[PDB]
């Protein structure tokens, strides 16, 4: 069980991830979203850790932890990251600084300790090798499930925070290995993509909102320690309408309305790869000084004001697979996910949000 | 294998059936169409056989066999009728003339030889009993699958040729017996009928014409000896537009464009009973003299000008059933009118041409 301080940070981490999701969902350039609240919060913790004055105070303020000691922040976030570990979960965090810069010992030790932070130098004078090394580090961290973070780095003169993840929900009741076929996923009413779908009928917590024209299903993960929640509108439509409805309170209402029913869950099968640069969105949440070359004070990090937060790459490979525990209906309700949906990974014990995302366009070709 | 003469007759029989189909499709009174090219050709053959002068020349001209000798047309249509016999298939040809008239020995011998045409004298003024006996003959011929030919016969004074058929395509890959449910078939955009549909996903020869907004599927029959071809527009629309496109040449183009793809075929299940009186339509194709009491010269039939062709009943019971031998699919969902063909694999010979516009069922 989480300590009271880690628990409060977790609540803010969730709220922050909802704000980040909403910010990104408003961008018409953004298709799929994948956010780990904890990893997003740990990134602000590094800014507090490495920074001074306003640069650091903003990070604590975004984290709503301004009344806590710096040690309490780092310890709590450290505890939350540690709590994500409970094969099917892989995380790596690396800070890339220019060749010229030198990371400070104290920072290097603290970041290793609380945030499991790896440190590297990067030379963008040879851009190919610079990209190659980031992408390879991510490939190795996720054992090839995330083969590329970015095709290009916009800002080359600062610090680069890269988080590389691989998550594979392991079901409490597995899908049959043969319950897999090729279907069409409707990205829009006029655009279909060829996907692999996996299928299972079982008793699931389910709710059909006839008023808001949406379905909600809860899929318990291994040993009911966490669960995957799927929110999908009845019709193929842009997620904008549903996203407006999505709040911590609305989710509580929907979940109370759920009941154990026979449900034929059909989901796309495969790895969804998402890379976000959180840089612009975090600045919108109050982290203004850290991302500005002229105002950034990351001097606890390097010893000098020779650094700014150029990027915060949140890169995830989320795998939808048949695997789960062996542990396991005449007229089921269909939860046929062949159109965009919103999903959440919730920790059962804490209520702590592990993932927030949406699948709008899976891998495949047009038809 | 067909003789070269039978093969050329078969090509004319197909072309004739295309002309007949087109003629009928233009008629607003016509709903479902079911034609056996061979049996249709065999009917013109009997008019050539029993009629003389213009009455016979028209019959050959309709069939587009005017450049052939009379014996070539009769012998070759006989071989075609014979080759068909080998899937469930039942045929009966029968000549009904008035009880007073006399069938000529020479014609009786030739009609039974080539066309297997049994002859029967009947009182047509005796309506209920007349109908009862024709409809019973058809019921027995088809083993009750076609219980009725017609509800009425308008011309008591002339000759009646009746063809009674039962055809049941037996699939090379059967439908699962439980893959059957109740759906709605859209006869029009304002009219839906409750039907039973049968469903199967498999590899089928398929073509989707994006330009002409239509789908074409080939469903092989038992041992790939023949196949059932389905032509349907993408959306619910009367078949008129598709029918304009339908030609022997266009069909050849479409079939060459087909390829083996995963197809989810959904078809109405049941027996479709179709009874056509070809009389009016054949007259429109050139067979004018034979159907007219005042111009008909069927003297090779009845030794005198005491006969005319009142009707040519082409009666078929086509059964769509699940029975047959033991990537992301494309939908071929036949819940709206479609055109279909039964083709012989070896010859290319057209066994059936038709369309299902309104299946059995109640309005919903």
């Amino acid at each position: 069980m989480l300590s009271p301080k880690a628990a409060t940070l977790a609540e803010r981490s969730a709220g922050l991830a909802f704000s980040l999701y909403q910010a990104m969902a408003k961008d018409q350039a953004v298709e799929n979203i994948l956010l780990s609240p904890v990893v997003v919060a740990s990134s602000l913790g590094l800014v507090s850790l490495g920074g001074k004055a306003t640069t650091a105070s903003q990070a604590k303020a975004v984290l709503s932890a301004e009344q806590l000691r710096d040690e309490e922040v780092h310890a709590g976030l450290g505890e939350l990251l540690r709590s994500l570990s409970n094969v099917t979960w892989k995380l790596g965090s690396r800070l890339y600084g220019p060749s010229s810069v030198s990371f400070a010992e104290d920072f290097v030790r603290s970041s290793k300790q609380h945030y499991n932070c790896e440190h590297s130098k990067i030379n963008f004078r040879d851009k190919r090798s610079a990209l190659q090394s980031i992408n390879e580090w991510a490939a190795q961290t996720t054992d090839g499930k995330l083969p590329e973070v970015t095709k290009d780095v916009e800002r080359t003169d600062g610090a680069l925070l890269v988080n590389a993840m691989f998550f594979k929900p392991h079901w409490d009741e597995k899908f049959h290995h043969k319950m897999v076929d090729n279907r069409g996923f409707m990205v829009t009413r006029s655009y279909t993509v060829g996907v692999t779908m996996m299928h299972r009928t079982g008793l699931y917590n389910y709710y059909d909102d006839e008023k808001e024209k949406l379905q909600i299903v809860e899929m318990p993960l291994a040993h009911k320690l966490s669960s995957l929640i799927i929110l999908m509108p009845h019709h193929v439509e842009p997620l904008e309408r549903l996203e407006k409805l999505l709040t911590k309170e609305q989710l509580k209402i929907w979940m109370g309305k759920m009941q154990k029913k026979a449900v034929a869950i059909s989901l796309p099968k495969g790895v969804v790869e998402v890379t976000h640069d959180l840089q612009k969105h975090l600045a919108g949440l109050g982290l203004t000084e850290a991302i500005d070359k002229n105002k950034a004070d990351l001097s606890r990090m390097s010893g000098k004001k020779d650094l700014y937060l150029a990027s915060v790459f949140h890169a995830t490979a989320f795998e939808w697979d048949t695997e789960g525990n062996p542990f396991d209906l005449r007229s089921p309700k269909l939860f046929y996910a062949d159109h965009p949906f919103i999903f959440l990974v919730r920790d059962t014990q804490s209520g702590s949000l592990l993932f927030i995302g949406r699948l709008v366009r899976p891998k495949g070709d047009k038809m | 294998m067909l003789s070269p003469k039978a093969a050329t007759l078969a090509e004319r029989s197909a072309g004739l059936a295309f002309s007949l189909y087109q003629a009928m499709a233009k008629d607003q009174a016509v709903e479902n169409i079911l034609l056996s090219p061979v049996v249709v050709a065999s009917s013109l053959g009997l008019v050539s056989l029993g009629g003389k002068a213009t009455t016979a020349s028209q019959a050959k001209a309709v069939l587009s066999a005017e450049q052939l000798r009379d014996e070539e047309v009769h012998a070759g249509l006989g071989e075609l009728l014979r080759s068909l016999s080998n899937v469930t298939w039942k045929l009966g040809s029968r000549l009904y003339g008035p009880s007073s008239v006399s069938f000529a020995e020479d014609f009786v011998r030739s009609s039974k030889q080539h066309y297997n045409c049994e002859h029967s004298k009947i009182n047509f003024r005796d309506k209920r009993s007349a109908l009862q006996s024709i409809n019973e003959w058809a019921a027995q011929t088809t083993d009750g699958k076609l219980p009725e030919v017609t509800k009425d016969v308008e011309r008591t004074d002339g000759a009646l040729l009746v063809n009674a058929m039962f055809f049941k395509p037996h699939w090379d890959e059967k439908f699962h017996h439980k893959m059957v449910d109740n759906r709605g078939f859209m006869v029009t955009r304002s009219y839906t009928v409750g039907v039973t549909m049968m469903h199967r996903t498999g590899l089928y020869n398929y073509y989707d014409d994006e330009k002409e907004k239509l789908q074409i599927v080939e469903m092989p029959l038992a041992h790939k000896l023949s196949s059932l071809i389905i032509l349907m527009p993408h959306h619910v629309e009367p078949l008129e537009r598709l029918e304009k496109l339908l030609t022997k040449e266009q069909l050849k183009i479409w079939m060459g464009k087909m390829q083996k793809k995963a197809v989810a075929i959904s078809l109405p299940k049941g027996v479709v009973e179709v009874t056509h009186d070809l009389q009016k339509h054949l007259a429109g194709l050139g067979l004018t003299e034979a159907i007219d009491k005042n111009k008909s010269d069927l003297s090779r039939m009845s030794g005198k000008k005491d006969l005319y062709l009142a009707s040519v009943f082409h009666a078929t019971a086509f059964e769509w059933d699940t029975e047959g031998n033991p990537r992301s699919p494309k939908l071929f969902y036949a819940d709206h009118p479609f055109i279909f063909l039964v083709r012989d694999t070896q010859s290319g010979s057209l066994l059936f041409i038709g369309r299902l516009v309104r299946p059995k069922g109640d309005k919903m």
Partner: peptide, 16 residues
């Protein structure tokens, strides 16, 4: 023997 298969594919679109 064996469990039921998956649901079938989505139905065709409606008329305009």
């Amino acid at each position: 023997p064996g469990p039921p298969g998956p649901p079938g594919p989505r139905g065709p679109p409606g008329p305009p």
